[PDB]
Structure 1
C-alpha cells in the first residue's frame, strides 16, 4: 500500500506525498509490475522537481524497466525536454540501449522531438547505433517523415559532444547536489573536457 501510493504520487507529481512516504521508510527503488520506479514515472509525466528530488535521494539512475528502458529513454520517448536536460545533467547515459536496441536518440527521432534530438546530439549521442532490426535514428526519422529531425541529424553528423561534461557544468554553477550525485555515480573528479581542463 505504501509503495503503490508512493508510485502514484511519483506519477501525479505529488512531491509532498512522495517525500512523506520516503520519510516513512518506503524503498525509493520500488517499481510497479512493469518495472517502472518513481524516477521512470516522473520522467514520463515531466515532473522535473520530482525527478531532481528522487535523484537527490539516491535513486539508481540507470535502472531499466522490463523493456530495458532507462529514465532517459522514457523522457525522450515522452518528449520531456526539461527532464532530459536534468537527467543528462545528473549523469544519464545518453547511449544506453534497451532490450530491442533502442537508444534515447532513436526514441526522440521517431517521435519528432526536435529539441530532445538536438540536446542528445550535443551531449554525444551516437546516431550510428542501430537497433536489432538495423535501423538508425536517421532511418526511422526518414520513414516517419520527420523532415526537421532528418535535417538536423544529417547536419550534425559526427561532430560529437559539444556540451561540457556534467561535472564541469556542476562546478560552473557551484552546485554541490548535482556534483555529489555525479561523483556517487562516477568516482573520477578529474574528468577531462575537450580543452583538457578539470572541474
Structure 2
C-alpha cells in the first residue's frame, strides 16, 4: 500500500505525497510489477522536479526495468528533453544498452525526438552501437522516415562529446547537490575535460567555494598540473579570487609552480594587478624574483598593466627595481613603452635608474620619444634623464621623435635645449629623418630652430 501509493505519486507528479512517503520509511528503490521504480515513472511523465528530488535521496540511477531500460532509456523514448538533460547532468550512462540492445540514442532517433538526439550526440552517445538486429539509430531513422534525425546524425558523424563532463558543469554552477550525487556515483573528482582541466580548475575560475571544498574533501588534486602547467592556484590568482587563493593555499597549493611559459601564481596576480592576492602569495613565500621564459619578473608584469598599487606593493617587498628581461628591459623601460607615467613616477621616485640601456642602447627616454608618450618624457627629464643620450646607432631622442613625427615631443625637446644638429653613425640629422618620413610640421619646427 505504502510503496504502491509512493509509485502512484511518482507517476502523477505529486511530489509532496512522495516526499511524505519517503519520510515515513518507504524504500526509494521499490518498483512496480514491470520493474519501474519512482525514477522511471517520473522520467516517463516529464516530472523534472520529482526526478531531481529522487536523485537527491540516493535512488540508484542505473536501475533497469524488466526490459532492461534505464531511466535515460525511458526519458529518451518518451521524448522528455528536460528530464534527459537532468538525468545526464547527474551522471546517467548515455551509452547504456537494454536487453534487446537499444540505446537512449536509438530510442530518441526512432521516435523523431530531434532535441534529445542532438543532446545525446553532444554528450558522447556512440551512434555505431547496434541492436541484436544489427540496426543503428541512423538505420531506424531512415526506416521510419525521420529526415531531420537522419540529417543530424549524418552531419554530426563522429564529433564526439562536445559538452563538458557533468562534474565540470556542476562545478561551474556551484551546485553541490549534483556534485555530491556525481561523486557518489563516480568517485573521481579529477575527471578531465578535453582541454585537460579538472573541476577544481573551473571552481577556482568562478570562485565557487562550496563545490571547491566538496571536491577537495573527496580527494581532488589541489596541485593538479595539466600539460600547460596551469594549476588551480594560477587560475585563482589570475582571476582575483582572494578567498579561493586562501582556500587552495590552506589545502596545500604549491607557491612556486610554473606554467609552460614559466609563470608563477605571483606573475598571474601581478599581471592583473591583484594587490591583496600578491601580498598573500608573498607572505606564503612566493619568489618575488622569479622569471618567465623572457626574463620578466612580477614587477615587469605589474608595470606593463599600469597596476600602480601592485608596483608599490612589490617594491615594498624588496623587488629589484632595475631587474632586466632577456631584452635588457627594466620596469622603467616597460613603463615608458606602455606610456604609464604613474608607474614610471613611482619607479623613479623609488630609485630606478633613468638612463638604463636596452639591448640596442635604448634609454627609457628614447622609448618615450618613440611612442609619443609626452608625460613619461617630462617625468624622465625632470628626474635627470640624459637628453642627448645616444644608442648603439647614435640615435638621440630628437632623432627618434623627428623620425616618428611626434610634434609635441619634438617641440618639447627643442624647448628644453636639445641640439638638432646631432648625427647618427651615418651622417644623418633629425631634419634628415623628418624629411625622409615626410613629416612637414616636424621638419618646419626643426628649421625654425638651428637645424
1:75 shift after superposition? 0.1
1:82 shift after superposition? 0.2
Residues 119-145 of structure 1, C-alpha deviations (whole Å, 9 max, x = no match): 000000000000000000000000000
- Residue in structure 1 matched with residue 173 of structure 2 by the alignment: 173
Q: Structure 1 runs of 4+ off > 2 angstroms? A: none
1:64 shift after superposition? 0.1
Residues 173-198 of structure 1, C-alpha deviations (whole Å, 9 max, x = no match): 000000000000000000000000xx
* Alpha-carbon distance in structure 2 between the residues aligned to 1:76 and 1:153: 16
* Alpha-carbon distance in structure 2 between the residues aligned to 1:81 and 1:122: 13
How well do the aligned residues superpose, as a CA RMSD in angstroms?
0.1
Tell me the SS of whatever aligns to 1:68: coil
Unaligned runs of 5+ in 1: none
1:91 shift after superposition? 0.1
1:107 equivalent to 2:107? Answer yes
Tell me the SS of whatever aligns to 2:154: helix
1:87 equivalent to 2:87? Answer yes
* Alpha-carbon distance in structure 2 between the residues aligned to 1:59 and 1:83: 15
The TM-score with structure 1 as length reference comes to: 0.98
* Alpha-carbon distance in structure 1 between the residues aligned to 2:192 and 2:56: 24
Task: Give the structure, 1 or 2, with the largest relative contact order (CA under 8 Å, sep 6 or more).
Answer: 1
* Alpha-carbon distance in structure 2 between the residues aligned to 1:17 and 1:159: 44
* Alpha-carbon distance in structure 2 between the residues aligned to 1:112 and 1:24: 41
1:34 shift after superposition? 0.1
1:57 shift after superposition? 0.2
1:20 shift after superposition? 0.1
* Alpha-carbon distance in structure 1 between the residues aligned to 2:160 and 2:13: 34
Residues 70-106 of structure 1, C-alpha deviations (whole Å, 9 max, x = no match): 0000000000000000000000000000000000000
1:2 shift after superposition? 0.0
Q: Number of aligned pairs? A: 196
* Alpha-carbon distance in structure 1 between the residues aligned to 2:100 and 2:167: 31
* Alpha-carbon distance in structure 2 between the residues aligned to 1:65 and 1:190: 32
The TM-score with structure 2 as length reference comes to: 0.43
1:158 shift after superposition? 0.5
1:55 shift after superposition? 0.1
Residues 147-171 of structure 1, C-alpha deviations (whole Å, 9 max, x = no match): 0000000000011000000000000
* Alpha-carbon distance in structure 1 between the residues aligned to 2:54 and 2:191: 25
* Alpha-carbon distance in structure 1 between the residues aligned to 2:158 and 2:52: 31
* Alpha-carbon distance in structure 1 between the residues aligned to 2:160 and 2:10: 34
1:56 shift after superposition? 0.2
- Residue in structure 2 matched with residue 157 of structure 1 by the alignment: 157
* Alpha-carbon distance in structure 1 between the residues aligned to 2:57 and 2:45: 19
* Alpha-carbon distance in structure 1 between the residues aligned to 2:45 and 2:193: 33
Greater Cα radius of gyration, structure 1 or 2: 2
Tell me the SS of whatever aligns to 2:174: coil
1:108 shift after superposition? 0.1
* Alpha-carbon distance in structure 2 between the residues aligned to 1:63 and 1:123: 20
1:47 shift after superposition? 0.1
